[PDB]
Ligand binder design. Structure first.
Ligand code: CUO
Ligand code: CUO
Ligand code: CUO
Lengths: 417, 624, 416
């Protein structure tokens, strides 16, 4: 039971260990070492083989297997830190809540831990990309600090809205598509414009934030599993994408010398991955924004109760990471910002396309618009790269508009009003 | 390392000494041997000793180097011990795989696996590793390719697998670079497995017995008017036959349209096999198909063969006559004379230009160019060695007859259309049969040692059951192995199996006679690349006096599948060199002129420099 | 939903037709063939491409779209109306393909019709037609006269199962194509070709049945109590007018009004044509519903195909090969096959969703479980018989579908 807690909760001693451990990890000459570990996610690409002419980046992104792969990725780091003497499991940075201040652990450049009394840079703040010549600190340009601009009510946040919807789906696959996209937002928000950062598929693993974020994402995934148990579906069992689950995920499958870790190696099959307990680590709490698991299930049914309209996007697979903004325009020509989502990617990325639609709830906008499902309105989308350069439309398919009336309002008055 | 290898090399010399062979002497690679080896020859280096030593000939004498080895032994085996040991090895028959080594790029490692083609189910994955070899090479190295194949002994693995030699398996190889970059395997040719042939009284499983001789193939000249008459009629009827068995359809089998891969294939390729040992099998099958047609036609006799070898004053006339006035009936065109190309809707130049006058004066009666070439082929004991020589001679007829005309015998695609094609192949088939007969005299059976893997594969389109082949018989002997025993399966015979009127026994003794004579040959590596071409070669002296060495030709078309001879083609330089009185060792330039059928000049770059091999004289052997 | 039943005309199975009924049909079609409408009507489906009267042409029929059943539904009525003009007493009959047929229907099959009343010998107009623009005769080559199987039924039945219209359409369309390839076969000018298929008269009969099935689904939907004439999918497409029905080339006023596919749903009273019975395989609608549920009972595993049908029509065969031999069966090589109808003329279309095929029976037979690692091998062949590069096509996915009761996990613990 290694415990993963909120980064904020962490003790100075807890922090102490992580800082020292990561710093030592950075130094680690071994294949288990940090620089080597980073290469797992992206460049240098290891996937086809460690030494192969054409190499692809290890991203089982855009796939059902995606959470499992990343789940192993986190533990790989966690086990590494433990080798370093990490006292606890990698902490999670809950993006879901709005955050005026960015996490101090990662943010501060220098760390003056009181025990040593010495001052050193915060290994968590950044890393250097050795193989890439850029011997620069993994730069994050959180150009959009805007993340802290949550809603006034404060509970409802973009992340929350997005995440809650993901929670609603029973199907694992359906869940993952929504789940994964929500995941992408943090990558873009931190990385911003910077060439070597969270924003890029290649570079992102280098930044230490990556681990913290994935820890949170993994945490939410765990949350979903718990909800499923409540549903009665077995949490471990996945019905969907059985074929992918069986396949082992590299480089985890590639054991030594590249992967010293035995656990991940044995665990490489994603089927095994679901029971997180197998990697002995747990989270202090499994809850989403204060709602009990039971509460969550009850609430979701209520959400259905009202009519909702969504736009569906088929994600074909982009090139480099890009963010898309779409708006609904009336025949009159009025147009309102519908909403946005982003996709993480790089050249190295293996090809991927979603099996299903990615729903986004247009309803609020249309309601203000006082537009009906029947109404003829057009949706326009603009895709922008990290740079801010505009990307052409034309290849991009148009989204569908779906109307979700309240369907099976399963209820009786047992909830307190 | 090199000291050891050099030591081993010395050991080999020592063993040769045990052989009582001149360890120093190196008959092969004469061209290279004379070449001095730089930079040693360059003499930038201080040591003059090496400079003198630069010729490799000198290199053999280690003693000149004046360095000795304490002992020359291999793995604790005496040189006597080694020799005795090797003898035992030869005792057992073995199976080997031949590998061509391109040897290009950086150093690379290759692995070969013989897998069992069987795979009923579940994304099958079962196979074993045959063995591997390595190659060394830098990025800037002179391009080199092995002239000869490198054999490996499969037998151990095969037995280990439990697969008997008699088993259907395929093999594949993988190449890995030192850098680790994968190399394309597709470029590499499939290695062939060879099994040790057993050569004795009956090599195939069928019983050839004293043949009844229902269908006989006779030479055109022997054919009488009556015989020719039936043939003319049969061919005429045959060409008329629109059916698949019909002539037009039959023509397609050889070349365009290329049905071979499939009637529907992304890459259509000419079905006919050329540049392969399979080559005689396919053609032999081809002739039968036409022949089976003739019988349906009602032809009394099998397809006649135009013995090209015999000198010919002119065209036989049966083929030549444009119009045949039997006068029994009404005059018509001679079906033998020409055919039409329906698809191109062009007319074949059946009246092909015979630029070269085949009519050739003989040193003595029978001796002729074709005879010499053909005879040479016959000399070779090896089927594969024979095929190369045999095929090339075969090519000459096409080039000569077709000439410049694009649509004709000269073209691979077109050749099938000409009716001469049948006549020539019949003869060629005859020679093949003659060779087998000669082998029989040699007491060399039908069993073929070479191209075992090739023999197993069925030859299309004959194999195609569902696509167009009417003849069941051809379908039956799709496999080339079956092809060898023509008499039993095909049930066709030849009036005489003689070459030049030489009895089989006589020819065998005759071959021995040529052996006694000194002969230097020029070897040409022929990877026949494009459209057919004729090549004439002459040897230039320092004097810059040149004499024409001789000529050979290759047939090909764009459609033809890529092929390359494993072995070199040999031609006999000797007479010319003698006249020049140039020594083999002497430095003489060799110039080759490659002329396209079109007649456009072809760059010499196409052909690599030919090697010169000198064959010293042996004693006269056996005679009946 | 009342909307499905018609007052005005009846469409009956071809076998059902009385000699009198058939006689009207024989004559009407022959006359239509003589009249201008028949050739022109054929054009609507495919070549010549009418869609853009001027400019680059594209095949008019919507295929690979949810609009697809609506378009064809309108198409059948167009011909039906033409027949009535012809003096046809009854609506176009439907050749129930699902029902296994001992032999091909006599009506279509007969080369010549005696028509004893008026001594005359004429070809059966039902038998075939000619393609005027491309001078040729339509041909048919049923490679498989074999069709006697649940296969049609399974495919259709599966389609019936889906509540979602769009989910339904994808499955429905695929089964639809089977008749085309099966009848047309190799023949270049036939049912098998997108352009040519309209010419064959069988086309009408086949579509009539397909349309009837659509109607069947519709009535089932009401049984489910889902709205019969309501599609909450591909809303954008539904409103779109369906050419050429929109244009003046189409004399038929009803169809023009009907052009929006939304209106298409209620065939009854709109079209004014009904079916004698709405049943599948002699199963009552309530019977089908019960039947559907039973299928639901077992867990199922499916293979999904992303159809980016492009190029000429082609047939695809696939099976799941298992990594080992031994005791375990080798590649069954027969997961199932589906065909796609297409032509060069066709406008590009891609399915929004996957096309699901139920692998379950085969997998169980081989003894593999859902979990078992297996690969799927697919072969795509053109009608021509030319192999198509499979590399371009995305690999199919394997989906596992279960009912509400799902399994609990061994590792981990769901309940707190
Ligand atoms: O997913 Cu690959 O990175 Cu967060
Ligand atoms: O060889 Cu294929 O043609 Cu004479
Ligand atoms: O689809 Cu257009 O033809 Cu049945």
């Amino acid at each position: 039971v290694m415990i993963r807690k909120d980064i904020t909760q962490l003790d100075k001693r807890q922090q102490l260990s992580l800082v020292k451990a990561l710093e030592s990890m950075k130094a680690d000459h071994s294949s288990d070492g940090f620089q080597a570990i980073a290469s797992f996610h992206a460049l240098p690409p290891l996937c086809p083989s460690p030494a192969a002419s054409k190499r692809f980046a290890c991203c089982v992104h855009g796939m059902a297997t995606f959470p499992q792969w990343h789940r192993l990725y986190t533990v790989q780091f966690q086990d590494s830190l433990r080798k370093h003497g990490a006292v606890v499991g990698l902490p999670y940075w809950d993006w879901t809540l709005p955050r005026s201040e960015l996490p101090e652990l990662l943010t501060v450049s220098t760390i003056h831990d009181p025990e040593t009394g010495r001052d050193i840079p915060n290994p968590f703040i950044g890393s250097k990309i050795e193989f890439e010549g850029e011997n620069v600190h993994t730069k994050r340009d959180i150009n959009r600090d805007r993340l802290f601009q949550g809603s006034t009510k404060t509970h409802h946040n973009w992340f929350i809205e997005q995440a809650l919807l993901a929670l609603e789906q029973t199907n694992y696959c359906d869940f993952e598509v929504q789940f994964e996209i929500m995941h992408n937002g943090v990558h873009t928000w931190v990385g911003g414009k910077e060439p070597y950062g969270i924003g890029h598929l290649h570079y992102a693993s280098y930044d230490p934030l990556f681990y913290i974020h994935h820890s949170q994402t993994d945490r939410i995934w765990a949350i979903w599993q718990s909800l499923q148990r409540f549903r009665g579906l077995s949490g471990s069992e996945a019905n969907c994408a059985v074929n992918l689950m069986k396949t082992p995920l590299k480089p985890f499958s590639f054991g030594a010398p590249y992967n010293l870790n035995d656990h991940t190696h044995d665990f490489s099959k994603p089927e095994d991955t679901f029971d997180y307990q197998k990697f002995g680590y747990i989270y202090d709490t499994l809850e989403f924004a204060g709602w009990s698991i039971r509460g969550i299930d009850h609430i979701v049914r209520n959400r259905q109760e009202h009519s909702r309209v969504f736009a569906g996007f088929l994600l074909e697979g982009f090139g480099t990471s890009a963010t898309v903004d779409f708006q609904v325009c009336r025949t009159a020509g009025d147009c309102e910002d519908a909403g946005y989502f982003t996709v993480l990617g790089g050249e190295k990325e293996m090809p991927w396309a979603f099996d299903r639609l990615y729903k986004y709830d247009i309803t609020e906008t249309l309601d203000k618009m006082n537009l009906r499902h029947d109404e003829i309105f057009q949706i326009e989308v603009t895709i922008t790269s990290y740079d801010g350069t505009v990307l052409d439309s034309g290849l991009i398919p148009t989204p569908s508009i779906i109307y979700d009336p309240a369907h099976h309002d399963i209820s009786s008055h047992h909830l307190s009003l | 390392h090199h000291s050891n290898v050099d030591r081993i090399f010395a050991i080999w010399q020592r063993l040769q000494e045990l052989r009582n062979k001149d360890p120093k002497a190196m008959d092969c690679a004469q061209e290279l041997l004379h070449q001095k080896m730089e930079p040693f020859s360059w003499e930038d280096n201080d040591i003059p000793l090496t400079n003198e030593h630069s010729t490799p000939a000198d290199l053999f004498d280690y003693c000149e180097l004046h360095y000795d080895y304490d002992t020359l032994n291999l793995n604790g085996m005496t040189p006597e011990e080694l020799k005795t040991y090797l003898d035992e090895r030869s005792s057992r028959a073995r199976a080997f795989a031949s590998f061509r080594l391109k040897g290009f790029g950086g150093s690379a490692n290759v692995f070969v696996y013989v897998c069992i083609p069987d795979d009923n189910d579940r994304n099958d994955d079962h196979c074993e590793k045959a063995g591997d070899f390595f190659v060394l090479g830098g990025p800037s190295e002179m391009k080199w390719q092995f002239y000869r194949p490198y054999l490996f002994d499969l037998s151990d693995t095969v037995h280990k697998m439990g697969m008997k030699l008699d088993g259907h398996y395929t093999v594949k190889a993988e190449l890995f670079s030192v850098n680790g970059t994968a190399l394309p395997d597709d470029l590499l040719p499939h290695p062939v497995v060879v099994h040790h042939p057993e050569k004795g009284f009956t090599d195939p499983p069928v019983k050839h017995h004293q043949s009844a001789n229902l269908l006989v193939r006779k030479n055109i000249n022997d054919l009488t008017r009556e015989e020719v008459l039936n043939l003319r009629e049969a061919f005429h009827k045959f060409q008329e036959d629109r059916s698949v068995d019909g002539y037009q359809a039959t023509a397609e089998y050889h070349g365009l349209p290329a049905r071979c891969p499939r009637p529907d294939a992304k890459d259509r390729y000419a079905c006919c096999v050329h540049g392969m040992p399979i080559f005689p099998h396919w053609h032999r099958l081809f002739v039968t198909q036409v022949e089976d047609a003739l019988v349906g036609r009602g032809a009394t006799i099998g397809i006649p063969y135009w013995d090209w070898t015999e000198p010919m004053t002119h065209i036989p006339g049966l083929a030549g006559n444009k119009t045949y006035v039997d006068s029994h009936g009404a005059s018509h065109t001679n079906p033998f004379h020409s055919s039409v190309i329906a698809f191109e809707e062009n007319a074949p130049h059946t009246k092909r230009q015979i630029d070269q006058r085949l009519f050739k004066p003989a040193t003595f009666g029978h001796h002729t160019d074709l005879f010499n070439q053909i005879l040479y082929a016959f000399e070779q004991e090896d089927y594969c060695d024979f095929e190369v020589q045999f095929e090339i001679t075969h090519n000459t007829i096409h080039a000569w007859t077709g000439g410049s005309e694009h649509f004709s015998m000269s073209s691979l695609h077109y050749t099938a259309f000409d009716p001469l094609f049948y006549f020539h192949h019949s003869n060629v088939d005859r020679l093949w049969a003659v060779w087998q007969a000669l082998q029989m005299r040699r007491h060399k059976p039908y069993r073929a040692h070479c191209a075992i893997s090739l023999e197993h594969m069925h030859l299309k389109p004959f194999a195609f059951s569902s696509p167009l082949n009417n003849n069941e018989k051809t379908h039956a002997n799709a496999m080339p192995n079956k092809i060898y025993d023509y008499e039993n399966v095909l049930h066709y015979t030849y009036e005489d199996l003689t070459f030049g009127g030489i009895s089989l026994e006589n020819i065998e003794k005759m071959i021995h006679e040529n052996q006694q004579e000194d002969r230097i040959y020029a070897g040409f590596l022929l990877a026949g690349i494009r459209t057919s071409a004729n090549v004439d070669i002459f040897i230039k002296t320092t004097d810059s006096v040149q004499h024409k060495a001789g000529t050979f030709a290759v047939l090909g078309g764009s459609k033809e599948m890529k092929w390359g001879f494993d072995r070199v083609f040999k031609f006999d330089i000797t007479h010319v060199l003698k006249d020049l009185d140039l020594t083999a060792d002497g430095d003489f330039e060799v110039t080759v002129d490659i002329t396209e059928v079109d007649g456009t000049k072809l760059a010499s770059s196409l052909i690599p420099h030919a090697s010169v091999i000198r064959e010293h004289a042996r004693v006269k052997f056996d005679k009946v | 939903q009342a909307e499905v039943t018609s007052a005005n005309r009846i469409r009956k199975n071809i076998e059902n037709l009385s000699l009198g009924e058939l006689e009207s049909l024989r004559a009407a079609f022959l006359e239509i063939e003589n009249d201008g409408t028949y050739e022109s009507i054929a054009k609507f489906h495919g070549s010549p491409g009418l869609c853009q009267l001027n400019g680059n042409p594209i095949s008019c029929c919507v295929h690979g779209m949810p609009t697809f059943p609506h378009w064809h539904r309108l198409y059948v009525v167009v011909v039906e109306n033409a027949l009535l003009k012809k003096g046809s007493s009854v609506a176009v009959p439907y050749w129930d393909w699902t029902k296994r047929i001992e032999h091909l229907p006599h009506l279509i099959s007969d080369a010549t019709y005696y028509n004893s009343r008026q001594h005359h010998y004429e070809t059966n107009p039902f038998h075939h037609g000619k393609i005027t623009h491309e001078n040729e005769i339509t041909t048919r080559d049923p490679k498989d006269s074999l069709f006697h199987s649940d296969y049609f039924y399974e495919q259709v039945l599966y389609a019936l199962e889906q509540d979602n219209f769009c989910d339904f359409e994808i499955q429905l369309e695929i089964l639809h194509n089977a008749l085309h390839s099966l009848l047309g076969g190799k023949g270049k000018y036939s049912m098998s070709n997108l352009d040519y298929a309209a010419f064959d008269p069988v086309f009408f009969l086949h579509h009539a049945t397909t349309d009837r099935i659509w109607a069947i689904w519709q009535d089932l939907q009401r049984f489910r109590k889902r709205p019969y004439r309501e599609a909450n999918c591909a809303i954008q497409l539904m409103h779109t007018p369906l050419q050429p029905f929109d244009k003046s080339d189409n004399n038929d006023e009803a169809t023009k009004t009907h052009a929006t596919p939304h209106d298409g749903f209620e065939y009854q009273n709109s079209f004014g044509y009904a079916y004698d019975n709405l049943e599948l395989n002699h199963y009552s609608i309530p019977q089908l519903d019960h039947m559907l549920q039973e299928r639901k009972r077992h867990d199922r595993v499916f293979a999904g195909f992303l159809l980016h049908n492009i190029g000429t029509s082609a047939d695809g065969h696939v099976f799941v090969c298992l990594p080992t031999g031994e005791h375990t069966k080798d590649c069954s090589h027969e997961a199932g096959m589906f065909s796609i109808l297409g032509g060069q003329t066709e406008m590009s279309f891609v399915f929004d969703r996957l096309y699901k095929l139920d692998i379950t029976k085969a997998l169980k037979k081989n003894g593999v479980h859902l979990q078992g690692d297996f690969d799927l091998e697919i072969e795509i062949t053109a009608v021509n018989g030319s192999h198509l590069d499979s590399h371009v096509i995305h690999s199919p996915t394997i989906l596992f579908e279960a009912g509400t009761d799902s399994a609990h996990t061994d590792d981990g613990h769901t309940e707190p």
